[PDB]
Amino acid sequence: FWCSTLVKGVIYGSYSVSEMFPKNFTNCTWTLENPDPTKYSIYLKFSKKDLSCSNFSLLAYQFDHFSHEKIKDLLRKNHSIMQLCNSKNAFVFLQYDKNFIQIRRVFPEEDQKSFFEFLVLNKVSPSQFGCHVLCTWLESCLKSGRTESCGIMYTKCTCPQHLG
Amino acid sequence: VPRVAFYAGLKNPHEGYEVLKFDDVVTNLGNNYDAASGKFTCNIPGTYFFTYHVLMRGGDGTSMWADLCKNGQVRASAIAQDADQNYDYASNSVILHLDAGDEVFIKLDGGKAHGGNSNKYSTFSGFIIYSD
Amino acid sequence: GGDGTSMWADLCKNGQVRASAIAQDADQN
Amino acid sequence: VPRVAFYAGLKNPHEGYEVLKFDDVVTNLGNNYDAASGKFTCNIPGTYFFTYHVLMRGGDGTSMWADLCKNGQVRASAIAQDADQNYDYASNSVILHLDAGDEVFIKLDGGKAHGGNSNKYSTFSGFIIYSD
Amino acid sequence: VPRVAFYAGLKNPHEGYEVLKFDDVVTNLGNNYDAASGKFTCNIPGTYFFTYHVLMRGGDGDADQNYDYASNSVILHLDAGDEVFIKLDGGKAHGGNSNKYSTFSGFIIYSD
Ligand SMILES: [Ca+2]
Ligand SMILES: [Ca+2]
Ligand SMILES: [Ca+2]
Incomplete structure (x- = not known):
């Protein structure tokens, strides 16, 4: 019944809030799947420069078993759900x-x-x-400027610039 | 004459005392194994060879018990242990004489199996050898 | 000890992966 | 025409350089495995396939070497290693061209074997594929 | 009957993403496997049982060699001209000059 979009085969992807919700279906959900949950880790950045929540509430949940909406049907699954605008940071x-x-x-x-x-x-x-x-990402982050805390682990790849 | 062979990779992460249900069926002759049932129902009495590899989940738990069982009596077992939460297989391979109407499946004796989506890290594969 | 040595082997038909094996182990020096 | 297959799980632990004695024989068509000598007197020449999995004695020993040997020539080996003293399968699978009368058997090259009495953890199973 | 089966071990250690070329062939009945190529070309289409075991060999530091087995076994429906080989995604595969620790063995079950 709901509308979802899964992105796979993608080393890197970019999309505005609108870039993921065109059908205008309230409750539409975007999906991302890890290429290999053993040798690949996922790192995401969203520019709260715009209050996506202000126009429409927006949350993020992780899940190991394929579910377009059911995994959220019982959102009580409360798998680390993270409101993506209550960000006291830019x-x-x-x-x-x-x-x-x-x-x-x-x-x-x-x-x-x-x-x-x-x-x-x-x-x-x-x-x-x-x-x-x-x-x-790391550079723009340590600023965003409080150069105090941007713990994006990069073991095995410290930046050629400003790092090491 | 009789052509019976099956091979299925696991698709979702199974943990606890439940039967593993391999769903990613790659090759299935005769259609005797139902990925949904996660079990192999013998309809052609004879002898079969069943080999299974089950991947321990990384970062959680230390011990993983995978025990192949035909009908209700366990006929094989396999243990995987790693203290620092690594990945270690719990594999085994058994030749079994299955008469008509027998059921065989991988039962999980505690632990958390991996949740490979299509990589087919965990596999279950069997084929007949002789007809009774 | 810590460290970590992992290895991924793939068996592929014409390029499309048919089998994957993972070997992850640290020997705690 | 020839039909030979066998599968024996290990019953008692074996330490030191010796020929592991697999006793819990589950399926022994052809009767070519004598648990007494832990050997596989191949009467029918041809091509055989043998797989074997041996568990490491938990808590005693760190690295155990196992070798499947035909006559006096070591054709396959495995090495189970774990500093923390946890369990870890030494496993292998081979295809051999056995002659008339030769004997294939597992020889533990150092280390301590572990063998559930009926948990049938460590297994040794083979069957003939082609007949010469 | 097809009359196809092979089994081979590895002598020279491999690295990177290059495909593993199991060279020390014990039996290659049917000569469909090239020891140097370490690959297998199906000339008789059908069902084939394949299996591979590799001994990982790495570590850091006191320095020791981390040894563990990456193993699997599959049933594949091969057609004419299909290619089967064990590409090492990433890591290190120990190689015995004659010790025969890393094995790759396959054999046909049915003929199409
Ligand atoms: Ca281990
Ligand atoms: Ca892979
Ligand atoms: Ca292991």
């Missing part, structure tokens, strides 16, 4: 290593203003390309 950074991540846009310019992006890295031998994507 940038929200989350990391996840389960098998499936889900973003739920539910009704209780800007569409092209907010922005979502995700990256997967070989926790053994990361790619210089993904490595510098991690690089840009």
